[PDB]
Amino acid sequence: KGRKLNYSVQDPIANYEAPITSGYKWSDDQIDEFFAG
Amino acid sequence: RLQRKRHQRALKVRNAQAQREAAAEYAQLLAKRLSER
Amino acid sequence: NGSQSIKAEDEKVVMPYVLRIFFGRAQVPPTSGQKRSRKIAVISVLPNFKKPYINDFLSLASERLDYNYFFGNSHQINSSKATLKTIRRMTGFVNIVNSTLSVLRTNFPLHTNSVLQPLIYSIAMAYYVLDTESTEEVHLRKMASNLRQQGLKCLSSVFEFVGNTFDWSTSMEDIYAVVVKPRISHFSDENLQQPSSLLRLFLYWAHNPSLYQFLYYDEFATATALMDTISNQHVKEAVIGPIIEAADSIIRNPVNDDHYVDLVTLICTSCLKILPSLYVKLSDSNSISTFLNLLVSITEMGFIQDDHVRSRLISSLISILKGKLKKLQENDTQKILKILKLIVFNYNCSWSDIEELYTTISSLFKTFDERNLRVSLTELFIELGRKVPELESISKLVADLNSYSSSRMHEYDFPDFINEKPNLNEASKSISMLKDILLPNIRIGLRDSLEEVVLSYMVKNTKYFTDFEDMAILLYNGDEEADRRQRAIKRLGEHAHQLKDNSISHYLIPMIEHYVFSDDERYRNIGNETQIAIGGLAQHMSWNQYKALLRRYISMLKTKPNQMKQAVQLITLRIVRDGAESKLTLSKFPS
Amino acid sequence: AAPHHWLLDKLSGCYAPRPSAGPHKLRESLPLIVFLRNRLKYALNGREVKAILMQRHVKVDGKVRTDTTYPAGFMDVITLDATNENFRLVYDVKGRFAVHRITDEEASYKLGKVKKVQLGKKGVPYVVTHDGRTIRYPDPNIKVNDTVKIDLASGKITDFIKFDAGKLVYVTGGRNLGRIGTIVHKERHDGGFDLVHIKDSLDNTFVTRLNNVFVIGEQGKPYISLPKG
Amino acid sequence: GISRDSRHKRSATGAKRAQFRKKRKFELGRQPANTKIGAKRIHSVRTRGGNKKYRALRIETGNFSWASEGISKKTRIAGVVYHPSNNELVRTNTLTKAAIVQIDATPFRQWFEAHYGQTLKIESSVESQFSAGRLYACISSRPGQSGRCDGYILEGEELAFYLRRL
Amino acid sequence: FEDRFDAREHKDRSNKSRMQAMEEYIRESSDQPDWSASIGADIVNHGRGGIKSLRDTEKERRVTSFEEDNFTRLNITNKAEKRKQKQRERNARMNVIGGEDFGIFSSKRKLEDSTSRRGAKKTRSAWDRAQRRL
Amino acid sequence: QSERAFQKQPHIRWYKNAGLGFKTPKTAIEGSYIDKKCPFTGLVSIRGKILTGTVVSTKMHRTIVIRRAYLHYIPKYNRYEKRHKNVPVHVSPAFRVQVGDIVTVGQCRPISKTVRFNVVKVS
RNA sequence: AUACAGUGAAACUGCGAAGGCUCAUUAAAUCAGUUAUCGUUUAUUUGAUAGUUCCAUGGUAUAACUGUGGUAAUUCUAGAGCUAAUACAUGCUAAUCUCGACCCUUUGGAAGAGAUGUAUUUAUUAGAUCAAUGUCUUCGGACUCUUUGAUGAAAUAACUUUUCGAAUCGCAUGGCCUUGUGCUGGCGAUGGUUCAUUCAAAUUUCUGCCCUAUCAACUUUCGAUGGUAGGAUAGUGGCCUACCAUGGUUUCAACGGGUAACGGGGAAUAAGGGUUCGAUUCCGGAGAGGGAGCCUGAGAAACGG
């Protein structure tokens, strides 16, 4: 289990991308009233 | 062209009658060494 | 294109038997000529037309080898094959001696015979064509002159065809029509027979059963002629016994003894050959030797002799009683041979054998004392059975001592032949003493004491189970005998057996000292026992390297003393092997 | 830039002649330019030794082999046609190439240490030597480090010298390189310092390897002639 | 592939401060060509002079050997069920050396019926495949180096030797 | 361990121990003559150089022997000449007075350490020195 | 004696001999042990040199860690500081080597990253 | 010299350049010797080394070259038309080898049976005996246990898109009468498959001068230590990956600390008096603007893509 699942932090991917604020065009209330069931 | 066809065939059969006879001619000397050993 | 056609042959089986027979029929329709050559023979043939025929035979060989079970065989292919074979024979035996196209058509004919034998190699018990006699008479009229042609170590065209024809059920109709076994037996009784003679003998031995199960009286007389060939080929399986395939001889001789009893001289020759089957080669196995002795007994149960084969069977039992191999199976067959040998010596032998071999009972020790009190005058097989019981067969120890003493009593009551019998007793006791036995070594020592009937006290004190004062008196007796080649070799062999790598006992230094003292007392006898001293030093030198070298080193050092006394006496010999053994000792020094 | 074996004077030049590839190795041979030009001095420079090589006077091992840097190693008999020059060159006692002069019946052959015997292909016994003469069919009792005698007209082995205790051996390699006398001792170890040991004037002792030694004859009778002083 | 050198890794003593060298030509690790089933395509790569190397990727015509008589005959490939040099290799169904792959054994049927006559002495758990058609057989040849798919059939001892495993 | 071919130990050195005082005493007690030149023939540049030293005329004799022996003139090879000819002639006009070099008397180098007081025949036993005398 | 897949067998029960003064035990000639890298049956061939010493640890299987102390004539501080060496070695079916046990090994064909030696003798 | 014939711009060709500067500081891991590779590559050097043939010579497609042109422009170009090969690629080819039923005795083999390769990758096996100078001589023999030697502990069933069985030349008209080049017929260089050697490279055994315990732990944190199999390899190899075991080095100096590591280690020549100046190979690895990927070759992660 040596090289298997190193839970470390890696240098070039720490800022490889950037997030997005709104993201999903739905609402989270639309998620809840989408899969209530 | 045809004189080359004479000479090619003659050198080929002479090469056979030299090599394939000399090979057995020292294989019989191996047979003499094996009989004397 | 040879590799391409080999690929086409390796993939030329995917279609059914109808399409395979259709492709074979198209191959047959190249140069068949069934309108011209299905009657007797061909009309005409050419070099390139025989090359189409040689290619047709090669394509038949390739097709049979590809489909080597069914082959899509047809009578059109058979007629084309017979036409090609007859045209090859006709062209080869009718063309003039120029040998180029003749050897081409001859290697066409041998390959066509090989392709013909391939058809019976592939589809033997499938077709069994009822119009066989057409091709049979064609090939017979072709190869009439092949009488002794197939007699070699590798001649297997017509010999393999004859073996195929003889190893069938109903395809022996062409065999029993006129002759197959006649020419086969001519080349079999040829005197320059190589090791295909055993193959032909096994083929006729297997083929006599089809000729016996055949209801035809012609095949019954042919089976009689096969038995007559087994009687007229009484030198082939004798002279060709160079391998361990003697089970074919033992399987024919049992078959012959179970089948045909035709002459008393034939039965005597069979018994003398099966006596040579145990007195010719020592590499005969248990089942083969048992069946050979049982076949000799089966010929003797029919037509034995009264003096000559009586003594031959008595010598057979005198060897088989010293053998007694394979957990008393050979002993039971030897008892049957002694009860079938039909003499007064054989009657006493069967009595004294059945009275001891009664399935692991006390009747052995009963019968030893019985024949001791009622000592028989045959005594040869009696000494054999009482020396096998004196050997390493655990029971009858005192009975073995009484048997040796009674043999000595008979050898003294003779007062010549029974002294030569005592020479055989001593030559048996020598190999008994040079062995790893325990009871039989003591029995051989008791036999040495009975032959000795100071020295007798020495022998009985060497066999005294005390070994300290006993070995001291043995050393003193060697000193008195110092102050005999085989005799001192036997005494030193018994001493070396009692001190033979038994390193769980003390005084091994004095034991090896007594061995070397007896060796020195034999080496003083230079006119007789110098050779025995050289042999004893040689056996001790072999033991100096054979896996144990502690006491054998002191044995070498103390057997050097004979050389020291001899060189002091000389003050001619063989320096060469002595110096080479000195070099071997110097090589053992660099160990 | 030179080795020690060539007997090469230092006041010669800057670039030393690398021998080309050939029978022997680089480290155990001298080329023809350092042979003819500056040892027995049949030339004065590379131009005229190439000139006499184009003229083809040299007949080393019975063949011409016109080349400047042809690596003549141990006992290749250099043969020169004019003034019937027959030269067998061996090792002296201090590491150089002593080139002895011999005669025609001695230059009609050479000898060679056998390196390995092989069942190579198609049932053919096989033998190699330091010039690599793959000659057919010797007897089965050719061990390693024995000595064949080459024919030098054809290639066949004519005589054979068995390697055993009590044979006259020549040592080419290590700190014993070029000694003769072959008897004080025999010692075959199991992987190193394994040999037959060689005497001296006071019969001193010496250690070498198996592959660094090879036999030349018997105790008093080598059929090679040897130089003296 | 990458490499063949001890310089990138630690020895039996535990050393550090490697930072060694630009890697040479003779540390050449080529890419692992996982040979599969497809249409027969062998890449002819070069190394060490004219040392052509056959890198097989989609080979089919396996020459698999009847064991008790040694009859190497031609057949197809189905799939490897067990090969724990990589337990995902059998999930992805590639074809490497020493793998146990399944074969439609119809030419072995043809050879048995051709050199024995009848159809079906041989073991029963391979007689079941004599009847059905798919027999287990293990690859001997190297398609990643020699480019070929040769193999040997499973007959009895080696059969149970793998069937008890998986 | 094992042997390794060493030309530096079977090479003729003979120069670590060649001292001019010992060599001069040997030339004195030699009892065979010395091959000296006709007297003017050994001065060099009309007297602009020295006479020439004994080592210089030995080296000159060696160079002319090699010269005639393989038919080649030696050269004006720049690095070796800028070392050896200029440094040699400057220490020649320093230390060679009238054909005799007096450089050695101005030089620390122990005689008995290297060139005398034998090392192989060291005789480190009373018995070995007794047998070396008798 | 089969704890792994992929037809554990000799590779052409099987038996050979390297020669050169090293015995082959009778179970290693005819026995059920596979001898994959034990040189008596093996796949490897022998060459090189042969080294001898006692052991330190035989903890893992197919790892024989020899020790080898040897004399060296030190001229620096004119006293002999004592040598020590280590070498891993594959097993043989002739001796379960425990602590002590001076044994010897022959050079052949690198098996792991650091082993070129395999046991040929125990005494 | 009416199919070639000397000069020869520009084009194909054979080869040439066949080993040159700067920058950051590696402690037997850079280096030197040595052991080995039946653990492996190899152009060139050298020695050796080929037997499957059914009813008078094989095909278009490109140059150079002409011709029409484009573009500011290149060792940038495109159409059209021809034309040659040691370029491409399909294909023409006598009978000899052993065992010898028979021998007519020497001029001895006629019949029959068995033959016939390489290159690639798969399995079974050939890879215990007999001869005397002697056991007993019964002056005959079963003889190996003794006394010594010997054969001896590639033959075959298949794949592969398989290479070949001379379209090279020179010297020598030479022998034969198959009635015309009817057979030519003798030798040598270049070929040509394969092996070994040599060359070189890669690994690998061991040996080799700083002070170092205020460096006492390191190694599993580029597998640590080994086993089994596969991949990749020129092959050996945890070199890489699956699974498994928890190993391995060390106070008999692990591992770690730096420079007069622009200095040192023989790395080597030594000099007829300079005693650590005084000959050289190498400081470590890189780099062709910067990292990355690919290609060529007997040899390369090319000073020239």
UniProtKB/Swiss-Prot annotation, chain B:
Disulfide partners: none
Assembly with partners or alone: Component of the small ribosomal subunit (SSU). Mature yeast ribosomes consist of a small (40S) and a large (60S) subunit. The 40S small subunit contains 1 molecule of ribosomal RNA (18S rRNA) and 33 different proteins (encoded by 57 genes). The large 60S subunit contains 3 rRNA molecules (25S, 5.8S and 5S rRNA) and 46 different proteins (encoded by 81 genes). Interacts with snoRNA U3. uS11 interacts with MPP10. Component of the ribosomal small subunit (SSU) processome composed of at least 40 protein subunits and snoRNA U3.
Organism superkingdom: Eukaryota
Annotated function: Component of the ribosome, a large ribonucleoprotein complex responsible for the synthesis of proteins in the cell. The small ribosomal subunit (SSU) binds messenger RNAs (mRNAs) and translates the encoded message by selecting cognate aminoacyl-transfer RNA (tRNA) molecules. The large subunit (LSU) contains the ribosomal catalytic site termed the peptidyl transferase center (PTC), which catalyzes the formation of peptide bonds, thereby polymerizing the amino acids delivered by tRNAs into a polypeptide chain.
Organism lineage string: Eukaryota, Fungi, Dikarya, Ascomycota, Saccharomycotina
More details: Present with 66000 molecules/cell in log phase SD medium.
Family indicated by similarity: Belongs to the eukaryotic ribosomal protein eS6 family.
Chain positions of cross-link Glycyl lysine isopeptide (Lys-Gly) (interchain with G-Cter in ubiquitin): 32
From Swiss-Prot, chain D:
Cysteine pairs bridged by disulfides in the record: none
Modified residues (Phosphoserine): 20
UniProt-listed GO biological process terms: cytoplasmic translation; translation
Alphabetical UniProt keywords: Cytoplasm, Isopeptide bond, Phosphoprotein, Ribonucleoprotein, Ribosomal protein, RNA-binding, rRNA-binding, Ubl conjugation
One of the record's GO molecular function terms: RNA binding
SUPFAM superfamilies: Alpha-L RNA-binding motif (SSF55174)
Pfam families to which the protein is assigned, alphabetical: 40S_S4_C, KOW, Ribosomal_S4e, RS4NT, S4
Residues carrying Phosphothreonine: 103
Cell location: Cytoplasm
Gene3D superfamilies in UniProt: 2.30.30.30, 2.40.50.740, RNA-binding S4 domain (3.10.290.10)
Coiled-coil intervals: none
Annotated ranges, domain S4 RNA-binding: 30-93
Cellular component, GO annotation: 90S preribosome; cytoplasm; cytosol; cytosolic small ribosomal subunit
PROSITE patterns reported in the protein's UniProt record: RIBOSOMAL_S4E (PS00528), S4 (PS50889)
General remark: Present with 573 molecules/cell in log phase SD medium.
Family: Belongs to the eukaryotic ribosomal protein eS4 family.
Subunit structure of this chain's protein: Component of the small ribosomal subunit (SSU). Mature yeast ribosomes consist of a small (40S) and a large (60S) subunit. The 40S small subunit contains 1 molecule of ribosomal RNA (18S rRNA) and 33 different proteins (encoded by 57 genes). The large 60S subunit contains 3 rRNA molecules (25S, 5.8S and 5S rRNA) and 46 different proteins (encoded by 81 genes).
Protein name: Small ribosomal subunit protein eS4A
Organism: Saccharomyces cerevisiae (strain ATCC 204508 / S288c) (Baker's yeast)
The gene coding this protein: RPS4A
UniProtKB/Swiss-Prot annotation, chain F:
Signal peptide region: none
Regions of compositional bias (Basic and acidic residues) in chain numbering: 125-134
Compartment annotation: Nucleus, Nucleolus
Chain residue ranges for the region called Disordered: 78-134
Purpose of the protein: Component of the U3 small nucleolar ribonucleoprotein. Required for the early cleavages at sites A0, A1 and A2 of the pre-ribosomal RNA. Participates in ribosome biogenesis.
Miscellaneous section: Present with 1430 molecules/cell in log phase SD medium.
Name of protein: U3 small nucleolar ribonucleoprotein protein LCP5
Species for this entry: Saccharomyces cerevisiae (strain ATCC 204508 / S288c)
From Swiss-Prot, chain G:
GO molecular function: rRNA binding; structural constituent of ribosome
Gene Ontology annotations of biological process type: maturation of SSU-rRNA from tricistronic rRNA transcript (SSU-rRNA, 5.8S rRNA, LSU-rRNA); ribosomal small subunit assembly; translation
Coiled coil regions, renumbered to chain: none
Keyword field: Acetylation, Cytoplasm, Isopeptide bond, Ribonucleoprotein, Ribosomal protein, RNA-binding, rRNA-binding, Ubl conjugation
Pfam families: Ribosomal_S17, Ribosomal_S17_N
Domain of life: Eukaryota
Post-translational modifications: N-terminally acetylated by acetyltransferase NatA.
Localization terms from the record: Cytoplasm
Database matches in InterPro entries: NA-bd_OB-fold, Ribosomal_uS17, Ribosomal_uS17_arc/euk, Ribosomal_uS17_CS, Ribosomal_uS17_N
Family classification: Belongs to the universal ribosomal protein uS17 family.
Note: There are 2 genes for uS17 in yeast.
Protein name: Small ribosomal subunit protein uS17A
